[PDB]
Design a protein around this nucleic acid. Structure first.
Ligand SMILES: [Mg+2]
Ligand SMILES: [Mg+2]
Ligand SMILES: [Mg+2]
Lengths: 171, 155, 49, 57, 131, 64
RNA sequence: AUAUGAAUUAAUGCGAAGUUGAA
RNA sequence: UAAUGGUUUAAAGGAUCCGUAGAAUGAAUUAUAUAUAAUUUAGAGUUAAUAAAAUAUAAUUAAAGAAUUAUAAUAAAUUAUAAGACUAAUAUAUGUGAAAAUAUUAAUUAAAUAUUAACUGACAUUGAGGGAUUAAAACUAGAGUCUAGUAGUAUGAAUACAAUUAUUUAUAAUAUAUAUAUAAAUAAUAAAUGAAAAUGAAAGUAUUCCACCUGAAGAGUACGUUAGCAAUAAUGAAACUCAAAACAAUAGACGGUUACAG
RNA sequence: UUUUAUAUAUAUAUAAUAAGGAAAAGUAUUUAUAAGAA
């Protein structure tokens, strides 16, 4: 699904900062402080390097990566800046968390608590997208196509019966 | 217009009467407001006041969507001679089985016949019927030849 | 119990009347031939032949 | 005392002296009635003491 | 991610006990830095007697050099650090505990915190630039 | 009971309310931005002490 | 398949005064 | 000729949750003809911020520890080896989890709280069928004793409301004192309910959805089917016999039932 | 409550002030109908 590909690529970009930071803004703030004193070059460079190493995705927790991914998904699907609850945004955010959970269970398969958590999340997405179908037919098909799902997946009854996992080779 | 909300209101008035509270509150919806007005005009409730969840309104407040969530209708209960005036309140038309009666069967009910397993009107009793989104006493509904849904029974 | 459960089949127990003379196939009487005549003792407290 | 001053006992997991201040001669964690700490403070003190025992300090 | 390592190194040379601590610290710091890590602090806890005669491999120790190294590093790399420590003859014991950086980015070591220094800024008293 | 229960808001009121709500949200963003910038500021302040250079690793090992 | 009969055969109900265990 | 019935204890709440259909039920305002359309935010949700150990819950990996067992040595004892299982205080299962369960340490991943702000705009409740996990036991295959299994046993949920007191518990204040207010937990109540025992913020007042019960025994038996190599499990009667049978409580004599006296 | 007055920085703290008083005599049909005992 191209959307998921781009979102999961943004995490693995060569340099992307955590905790809400980006390279441009940190650069601005660092240069501004450096200028402030005016009114050895090696040390400031390696100090900058240490800062950037501290704030790196590769350094931070996976939870932070998923937080950033959810932010990107919301930014993409939002009706207007700041929108968070329109069913498109809800579907996208739950989709990202579903991807993360599916990875989690795929790694180790006896974790039944998180398995039922994931099933509940999937069924929640089904419910919200069904409501979207009823309310906004156009945005509904737009959304299921972007997220990589046909109407069959949303409409039908779904559970992760192990036969599902055998069918789609989930493990 | 929920019969669920109206049933909750009916049970709330019953409980408030049993523990002898002078003033209580109900949801501020037109069904509840029409209900409270019809009970009040018949002497069952002492008074109606506008208010919020905290209490009755001190000064007049306009009703807007901004404050609608916390709006409440404060009903004052009557207790006379150490007894509750509004002794009991019931819903004839349950949310499952809704009873929409034509005028002839309302006359039969008022005249003592049991229609659709509804116990007929009693002397000191009050029955409310909603016709075309207006609540009214069953007697007035018959007087205006209005077909309607029978809702409740307060004795 | 609930209106749908009542609708789906539940209800008061059928006050079912079974025949106390099943072999008479709903006839007031039936003719018959006596294979044997037998003397029996009733259940106590009663005693007799 | 000091963990009754609003400090976090988990922070005192690399300071075996203070952890020893709240154990019996044989090393037994002192029940809450003896220590008189809050619940939450007692739980972090127990966790910190058991961590200290785990890391060999 | 912050991780405090508390290592217990064996004293085999009685005249210069500290050398093994220096060599292990150098090796681990090289791993951390060369793997896109940072070693924020090294606290040299003194030489102390062990609570018991604790045994690693065949040799038995009674006293050791304790040290604390606070470092910001990634998960796989701390896993490899621990694997190296456990298989290293010099390290009697190791313990690597995460320090949550959720609320503040810069945080001190457990001992300096226990004194009352929740961040290394208070450790190195003041910076003295504003706005 | 005949009159409408509530007076629906005119679109001018809707625009004004939009302005107030967006002000609240943007103010929260502004506080969070101040906080992240201040944390970055303190991090860079004390980043002198941190050790990213092996040449400095040996220095501080010898010092300590 | 719907029935009707069957040597051979499974279980259980009753009752007669009792017989044996101590669950 | 009693369902103007019941399910803690008389027959009967399904182990726990998730959720499809429901010819099941379900927010607010306006307008039009019993719904439809447009608006709205009280239900249900989404994203952040803060506070808190979200520590306990799962899986995985990596460690620690007492002792046990066996082997070897020295003269039950002291050392040295390997093996596994278990987690001694804290300690209350306080808590966490839907239940079953779970308290030696660290880490990785996942999830669970509240309040505020913003956003969606009824997207909700329950849930037949179905699906997940399901102790111990039973055995089946692949691997060298282990893994992968078959199988599925052994006071329902939600919403509105409901007088006190006394303790705690967690916050919010005001200057230890306001014997401080707001909440939840615990105990005795009032009213109310009940056949009573007893319940007493639920076994109360109401609404909605599902499951279950219809005298005792025959019988959870037989037969058939369903899965299973099988074991077993699920579904599950009928004839005959009887006026019984059962529950709570009352007084009694009875027990090696308890003590205690005279 | 409301209205004003002073003071202070359109607003805030203080002081005063309050319009709701009317009387009169006479002017049935009720409806359908559910019992238990051993
Ligand atoms: Mg849902
Ligand atoms: Mg009848
Ligand atoms: Mg029973």
């Amino acid at each position: 699904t191209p959307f998921i590909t781009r979102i999961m690529a943004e995490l693995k970009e060569p340099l992307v900062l955590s905790k809400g930071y980006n390279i441009e803004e940190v650069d601005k703030f660092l240069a501004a402080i450096e200028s402030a004193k005016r009114e050895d070059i090696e040390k400031l460079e390696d100090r900058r390097e240490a800062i950037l190493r501290i704030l790196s995705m590769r350094n931070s927790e996976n939870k932070n990566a998923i937080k950033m991914a959810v932010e990107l998904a919301r930014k993409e699907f939002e009706r207007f800046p700041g929108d968070t609850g329109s069913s498109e945004v809800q579907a996208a955010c739950m989709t990202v968390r579903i991807q993360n959970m599916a990875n989690h269970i795929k790694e180790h398969r006896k974790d039944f608590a998180n398995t039922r958590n994931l099933r509940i999340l999937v069924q929640q997405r089904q419910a919200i997208l069904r409501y979207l179908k009823r309310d906004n037919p156009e945005k509904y098909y737009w959304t299921i196509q972007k997220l990589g799902l046909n109407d069959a997946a949303i409409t039908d009854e779904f559970n992760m019966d192990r036969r599902y996992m055998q069918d789609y080779e989930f493990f | 217009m929920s019969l669920v909300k109206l049933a909750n209101t009916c049970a709330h008035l019953q409980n408030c009467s049993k523990v002898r509270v002078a003033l209580t509150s109900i949801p501020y919806t037109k069904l509840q407001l029409q209900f409270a007005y019809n009970l009040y005009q018949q002497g069952f409730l002492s008074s109606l006041q506008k208010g919020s969840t905290m209490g009755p309104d001190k000064d007049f407040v306009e009703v807007t969507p901004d404050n609608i969530s916390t709006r409440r209708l404060w009903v004052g209960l009557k207790y006379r001679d150490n007894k509750p005036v509004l002794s009991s309140c019931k819903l004839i038309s349950k949310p499952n089985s809704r009873i929409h009666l034509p005028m002839e069967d309302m006359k039969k009910l008022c005249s003592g016949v049991t229609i659709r397993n509804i116990k007929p009107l009693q002397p000191g009793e009050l029955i409310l019927v909603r016709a075309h989104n207006n609540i009214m006493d069953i007697n007035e509904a018959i007087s205006k030849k209005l077909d309607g849904e029978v809702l409740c029974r307060v004795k | 119990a609930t209106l749908n459960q009542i609708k789906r089949g539940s209800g008061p127990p059928r006050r079912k009347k079974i025949s106390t003379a099943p072999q008479l196939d709903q006839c007031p009487q039936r003719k018959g031939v006596v294979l044997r005549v037998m003397v029996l003792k009733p259940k106590k407290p009663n005693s007799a032949q | 005392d000091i963990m009754k001053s609003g400090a976090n006992p988990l922070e005192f997991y690399a300071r075996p002296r203070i952890l020893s201040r709240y154990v019996t001669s044989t090393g037994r964690i002192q029940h809450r009635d003896i220590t008189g700490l809050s619940a939450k403070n007692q739980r972090r003190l127990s966790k910190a003491i058991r961590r200290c025992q785990a890391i060999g300090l | 991610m912050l991780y405090e390592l508390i290592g217990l190194v064996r004293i085999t040379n009685s005249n210069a006990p500290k050398l093994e601590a220096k060599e292990l610290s150098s090796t681990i710091g090289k791993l951390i830095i060369q793997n896109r890590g940072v070693v924020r602090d090294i606290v040299p806890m003194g030489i102390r007697y062990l609570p018991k005669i604790m045994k690693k491999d065949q040799e038995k120790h009674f006293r050791a050099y304790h040290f604390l190294m606070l470092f910001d590093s990634s998960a796989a790399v701390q896993s490899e650090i621990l694997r190296t420590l456990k298989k290293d003859p010099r390290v009697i014991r190791s313990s690597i505990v995460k320090v949550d950086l959720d609320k503040q980015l810069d945080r001190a070591s457990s001992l300096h915190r226990s004194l009352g220094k929740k961040s290394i800024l208070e450790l190195v008293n003041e910076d003295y630039q504003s706005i | 009971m005949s009159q409408p229960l509530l007076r629906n808001r005119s679109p001018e009121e809707s625009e004004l309310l939009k302005l107030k709500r967006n002000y609240n949200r943007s103010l929260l963003n502004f506080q969070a931005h101040k906080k992240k910038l201040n944390e970055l500021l303190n991090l860079y302040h004390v980043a002198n002490e941190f050790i990213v250079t092996e040449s400095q690793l040996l220095k501080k090992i010898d010092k300590v």
